[PDB]
Each structure stands twice: as structure tokens, then as C-alpha cells.
Scaffold this active site. Sequence first.
Site, PDB file in Angstrom:
ATOM      1  N   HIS A  41       0.780  -1.068  -0.066  1.00 61.82           N
ATOM      2  CA  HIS A  41       0.129  -0.005   0.023  1.00 61.82           C
ATOM      3  C   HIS A  41       0.894   1.280   0.111  1.00 61.82           C
ATOM      4  CE1 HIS A  41      -0.187  -0.321   4.432  1.00 61.82           C
ATOM      5  NE2 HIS A  41       0.115   0.980   4.341  1.00 61.82           N
ATOM      6  N   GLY A 143       2.384   6.190   9.080  1.00 60.41           N
ATOM      7  CA  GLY A 143       3.596   6.384   9.196  1.00 60.41           C
ATOM      8  C   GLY A 143       4.215   4.962   9.689  1.00 60.41           C
ATOM      9  N   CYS A 145       3.509   1.759   8.978  1.00 64.49           N
ATOM     10  CA  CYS A 145       3.389   0.860   8.367  1.00 64.49           C
ATOM     11  C   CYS A 145       4.852   0.438   7.738  1.00 64.49           C
ATOM     12  CB  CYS A 145       2.492   0.900   7.213  1.00 64.49           C
ATOM     13  SG  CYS A 145       0.793   1.579   7.589  1.00 64.49           S
TER      14      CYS A 145
HETATM   15  C1  LIG Z   1       1.006   3.287   6.951  1.00 67.16           C
HETATM   16  C2  LIG Z   1      -0.097   3.815   6.434  1.00 67.16           C
HETATM   17  C3  LIG Z   1      -1.081   4.211   7.661  1.00 67.16           C
HETATM   18  O1  LIG Z   1      -0.749   4.917   8.414  1.00 67.16           O
HETATM   19  N1  LIG Z   1      -2.478   3.940   7.726  1.00 67.16           N
HETATM   20  C4  LIG Z   1      -3.060   3.214   6.598  1.00 67.16           C
HETATM   21  C5  LIG Z   1      -3.185   1.859   5.852  1.00 67.16           C
HETATM   22  C6  LIG Z   1      -4.044   2.076   4.980  1.00 67.16           C
HETATM   23  C7  LIG Z   1      -4.605   1.102   4.031  1.00 67.16           C
HETATM   24  C8  LIG Z   1      -3.771  -0.373   4.394  1.00 67.16           C
HETATM   25  C9  LIG Z   1      -5.869   0.823   4.032  1.00 67.16           C
HETATM   26  C10 LIG Z   1      -4.240   1.168   2.534  1.00 67.16           C
HETATM   27  N2  LIG Z   1      -4.264   3.307   4.699  1.00 67.16           N
HETATM   28  N3  LIG Z   1      -3.669   3.901   5.754  1.00 67.16           N
HETATM   29  C11 LIG Z   1      -3.124   3.654   8.910  1.00 67.16           C
HETATM   30  C12 LIG Z   1      -4.491   3.165   8.873  1.00 67.16           C
HETATM   31  O2  LIG Z   1      -4.688   1.726   8.714  1.00 67.16           O
HETATM   32  N4  LIG Z   1      -5.545   3.947   8.838  1.00 67.16           N
HETATM   33  C13 LIG Z   1      -6.871   3.613   9.190  1.00 67.16           C
HETATM   34  C14 LIG Z   1      -7.639   3.601  10.450  1.00 67.16           C
HETATM   35  C15 LIG Z   1      -6.666   4.299  11.343  1.00 67.16           C
HETATM   36  C16 LIG Z   1      -8.701   3.024  10.578  1.00 67.16           C
HETATM   37  C17 LIG Z   1      -9.484   2.346   9.667  1.00 67.16           C
HETATM   38  C18 LIG Z   1      -9.026   2.373   8.339  1.00 67.16           C
HETATM   39  C19 LIG Z   1      -7.645   2.804   7.996  1.00 67.16           C
HETATM   40  C20 LIG Z   1      -7.036   2.695   6.681  1.00 67.16           C
HETATM   41  C21 LIG Z   1      -6.670   3.908   5.835  1.00 67.16           C
HETATM   42  C22 LIG Z   1      -2.434   3.525  10.070  1.00 67.16           C
HETATM   43  C23 LIG Z   1      -2.775   4.273  11.430  1.00 67.16           C
HETATM   44  C24 LIG Z   1      -2.088   3.840  12.411  1.00 67.16           C
HETATM   45  C25 LIG Z   1      -1.617   2.600  12.620  1.00 67.16           C
HETATM   46  N5  LIG Z   1      -1.340   1.893  11.509  1.00 67.16           N
HETATM   47  C26 LIG Z   1      -1.919   2.288  10.453  1.00 67.16           C
END
Ligand SMILES: *CCC(=O)N(c1cc(C(C)(C)C)[nH]n1)[C@@H](C(=O)Nc1c(C)cccc1CC)c1cccnc1
Lengths: 304, 304
Positions: A41, A143, A145
Site C-alpha cells: 500500500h 507512518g 506501516c
Molecule cells: C502506513 C499507512 C497508515 O498509516 N495507515 C493506512 C493503511 C492504509 C491501507 C492499508 C488501508 C491502504 N491506509 N492507511 C493507517 C490506517 O490503517 N488507517 C486506518 C484507520 C486508522 C482506521 C480505519 C482504516 C484505516 C485505513 C486508511 C494506520 C494508522 C495507525 C496505525 N497503523 C496504520
Amino acid sequence: SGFRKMAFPSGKVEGCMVQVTCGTTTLNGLWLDDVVYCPRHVICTSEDMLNPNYEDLLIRKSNHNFLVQAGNVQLRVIGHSMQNCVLKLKVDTANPKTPKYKFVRIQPGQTFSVLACYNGSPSGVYQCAMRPNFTIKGSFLNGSCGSVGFNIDYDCVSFCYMHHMELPTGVHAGTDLEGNFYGPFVDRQTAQAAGTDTTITVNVLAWLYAAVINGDRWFLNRFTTTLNDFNLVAMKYNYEPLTQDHVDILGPLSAQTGIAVLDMCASLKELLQNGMNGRTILGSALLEDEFTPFDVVRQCSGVT
Amino acid sequence: SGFRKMAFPSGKVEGCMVQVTCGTTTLNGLWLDDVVYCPRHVICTSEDMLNPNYEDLLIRKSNHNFLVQAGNVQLRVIGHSMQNCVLKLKVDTANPKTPKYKFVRIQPGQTFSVLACYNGSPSGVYQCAMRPNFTIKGSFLNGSCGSVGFNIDYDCVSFCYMHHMELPTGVHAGTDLEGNFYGPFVDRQTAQAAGTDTTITVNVLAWLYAAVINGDRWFLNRFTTTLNDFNLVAMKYNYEPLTQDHVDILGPLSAQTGIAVLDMCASLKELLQNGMNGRTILGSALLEDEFTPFDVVRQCSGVT
Ligand SMILES: *CCC(=O)N(c1cc(C(C)(C)C)[nH]n1)[C@@H](C(=O)Nc1c(C)cccc1CC)c1cccnc1
Ligand SMILES: *CCC(=O)N(c1cc(C(C)(C)C)[nH]n1)[C@@H](C(=O)Nc1c(C)cccc1CC)c1cccnc1
């Protein structure tokens, strides 16, 4: 004596953390040999996270679009491929700090250490367990990830987890280093609810053994039980069923303490039915389930 | 989101761990520049631990009696001196892995990471706090002496603790890197009882802020209190008195959440008087006091 939620020394993993940027997205990568692993991603913009077609998005990316930076120096990307939900970026330089390593896919209930990173820089280390619903209760911000979960056996790092996402309920989902997600999670911003977060019974028993070894014996009772009777109580309290394999795994702790596994099971059964009554075990007011029997033996013996 | 008991990445400290042997005693040493620091009780046999005269015991030791081994190689000892309860062994080689460092003497309530070691090899890392009675609730076995406590500010390691002993009650005592013990403890096998282990109030409030920031808000109430009224309750529950300095330190957390410090104090007051009623805050069934306000800000912002 003293029992702590202890992580593996993170040195060997710190030497592998790199920053990966693709367009405007920046996350962490793991640099082992001449390959940098990172969540696929990284190629996603905030828009396409809702319904990404990774293969299609990937066609628009070339080697020069992935910027890999290790410390203050840039790595040259000479190849890229997608393996399940991870991108493997072949670089022209083998990581001089590559430790002896293995990629392992762990089972639920197993514990590991996480080196939380932001922009390829490590900020903290903590001990986790893969929950029975295949989520992890981590501490990850945007950030983070590409941050990884691992275990160390003397000088060999077994990488088991790579962080990919936060579910809407604040729990975390990720893959093994082959890019396969633990559980049924997908790298898409969609309704993904976790299943029942059951307690890891074998780990609670291991921690009760650790408590006895460190002097906390108040919960020891005059009762015993059977695997089937115990399991009826465990079912009621959303605890994982205890098997003869778990009993066998608890053998060394049972031997060291002189407390038969089924006797500890009856102590646990009374703790479930009566509660702690305002008391603590190893400084905790709830039954800790993120220490495996191997962690208890290792911590209590001082394996380096 | 998610809040974990997080330690600093241990890499920079792992590169400093050495093994020190004097006669039959083997413990850990910290190698910074051309000096190896270690507890002076390395010169002690099991016999003289009851009433050691360190100066006298030291006269019988020469440079060649201290065996310092870094990895599988031996360091040449060209000088030795005792500074309070630590021995400083001048070696002929500067540690090539010496990070930027400082020696700091921390105040009670302050937190730090410990790299637990055995025979100069690191086995685990965990986060601790210097208790208000100057003990630490660690996880240390025989041979762990010389293991160190530290904090990291970007690339500078501030060493604050060196493990020396386990008190008969299973708690731990140690020195700063100048060899001065925290608290009234001495490096002698004698009756040394710890004082009241009061709860670090400012850290509990910091952790309540962390809980609110991560979604756990059930404990928030409709009340407020004053510093004096709060402190009457804190005295009753063996909590440290809260000062205006602590209120000031909680300012950034108060600002981010929009919850005035005295309002969080009233929430804490009700949690003390009513208990958790079988509920949890940030996965814990008791009020966590080993996160300072700085740790909450750092963890919640992702400082690397
Ligand atoms: C490293 C990217 C990131 O910070 N996040 C993330 C992951 C993704 C996908 C895998 C869907 C492309 N998009 N953004 C977030 C994250 O998972 N954000 C998030 C949250 C907080 C709740 C529901 C859905 C989503 C997806 C956008 C992230 C934030 C904190 C910890 N890990 C990942
Ligand atoms: C590194 C040496 C060691 O393992 N310990 C130790 C320290 C000492 C002094 C400082 C008194 C010379 N002697 N032995 C023990 C330890 O402190 N042992 C101990 C205990 C467990 C309880 C009461 C008194 C003593 C002192 C002998 C040690 C063991 C576990 C963790 N840290 C230190």
C-alpha cells in the site's frame, strides 16, 4: 526475580529499518540482503485506499519511483515485485547489517517484539501477541506501516509480522514477511471487523507459573480439575480451549514448581469464577495472556 | 492508536555491553569510550557480601585481575578506580560503537528502559520507573548486575541506572553511572527494607490523558476538584502529592484533549473512591503509573 513484559533487544532489527517513499506516501521498509520489504500500500494515494487494484496501480510505477533511504543515504532500486501484500524492492547493495534471519508465520497465541518505526527510524520496542482473532493490540500511528514483529533465537532473527493497518476499532492487522495477512484482513479501507478476542489460556497458565516462581502464591487453591471440566469454564469466559498439547507445553513449568498443570487449571478456574477480589498477581489486576510458556522459561532462566 | 509500555530501541546500548569477571564473579559492564563501568561488588566473593570493605578488597586486585570481554574478544585493562559503588576500568581500546551519551541522575517517578544482560549479552528490554521509594520493579536474575537503565533523545543515550542488587522483598536497587545509589541502599547483603511504594500521581494522570486520546473515556465524569482537595484523597490512597509543577507538566496533554488538569484529577479521585467496577482502561485493570507525561506526548506523536 521480578517478571516484566520484556521485548527482545532490538539492535539487529534497527540495522534493517529503511524509509520507503513512493510518490507522496512514506512508510517503513525492512532491508535484508539486497531486498527491501514493505507494505504494497506504499503505492497507494489516500484516494485509492477505498478500493485499490494493486496490480493496476503497480504498472504505473517504475524502479526509480521507489525511494529507499537507509540513514542519510539513498539506495538504488534495480528491481521490484509484488508478493501477496508486500513489495520486494531489489536494491544494488546488500545490507551490511543483515543479521542471520528467517521468515516465519506464527500461530495465534504466539508472542513477538515490535520495533515501532516512523520514516525508517525506530522509536520504540514492545512485546505483543498475535490474538486468537489474528489482530495485534499494538501502538502504531500513521507512518508506522512496514514496522516489524520478530523473535530472536541467540543470533537469528525470525521475522513474523509486518504492520499494514489499523482497523476502525483501534486494533492492528498485518502480514507475515511473505505478504500474507494474518486473519481475514485485506489492505483496503473497508468495513473489517475483528472476531471475538478470546483469552490465550495456555499463556495465562504460563503467567500463573511465573507468578508462583516469583512469590505470588495467594491464588493457589486446594482444588484440581479435568481438561473437560476446565474447558467448560474456559468456554463461559471466552478463553481458548486448553488441549493436551498445551498441557505438554506447560510440563517444564509444572516440573519446576511442583504444581501439576490441572491443579493450576483449577486455580485459574477459581480466579475466573471469583475474580481477583481487589488483589494483584505480578503487579497486574487482570489475568495476563501475552507471555507464552517459552517466554516464562526463557525470562526465568536468562537465555541471551 | 493503541498505547503500549514501550521501551527505547536498545541497539545503541547493546553495542556497549561487555562481560566483566574478577576471580569467580561474572557480571555486566558498560563500555563507553576507553572506560568500562561495572558494580564494584564484582570484586566480592559470596562470603564477603555480608560486610565488605571495598577499599581493602580492592587493594588485592590488579588491572590483570579484571577480565573484560566484548563479544568473543578480550580487552586489555590499563587502569582501575572505584568511584562510589562503581568500578571504572580503563581499557586500551575505545569502544567503536560508543554512541553520544550523558550520565544522568533521574528523579523518582521518572521512567527509563532497561537492557537486561547476562555475561555481557543482552537478553531483553523493558520499560521501568524509578519508584518514589528509590527501588525499581525490574526483572533481574543472578548475573544481571551491571545491566543499565537509559533514555534516548534522538541519538544521545542518557544512562541513568546500573543494576546492583535485589532486596529481600524482590524489588531492585542500583546506582546512577557515577556509582551513587538511588535511595538509601548499600551494596551489602544486609536487612534493607524499602519504604512505602506510593503511586506516581502525575504519571497516572498522564496515562488517563493517553487513554482519552486513544478512545477510553468511560471514566470521565461531570466533576472537578482543587489541588488541595485532590491531595487529601491522594494521601488516603498512598498517591504522591500533586503539585502545580505537575499541573504545568500536564499542560500539553490538557491542551490536546481539552480536559483541564483539575477535571482529570476529579476523574482520578472518583476512580480511587469507586474502583474500576470490573472495567479496564487501556487494557489494564489498575491505574498505570509508569508513563510520564513526556512518554505520553512522545508515544502519541511518534518521536524517533
Ligand atoms: C502506513 C499507512 C497508515 O498509516 N495507515 C493506512 C493503511 C492504509 C491501507 C492499508 C488501508 C491502504 N491506509 N492507511 C493507517 C490506517 O490503517 N488507517 C486506518 C484507520 C486508522 C482506521 C480505519 C482504516 C484505516 C485505513 C486508511 C494506520 C494508522 C495507525 C496505525 N497503523 C496504520
Ligand atoms: C550480580 C550479583 C547478583 O546476582 N546479586 C548480588 C548482589 C550482591 C551484593 C550487591 C550484596 C554484593 N550479592 N549478590 C543478586 C542479589 O542481590 N542477591 C540478593 C537477593 C536476591 C536478596 C537479598 C540479598 C541479595 C544479595 C546477595 C541479584 C539477583 C537477582 C537480581 N539482581 C541481583
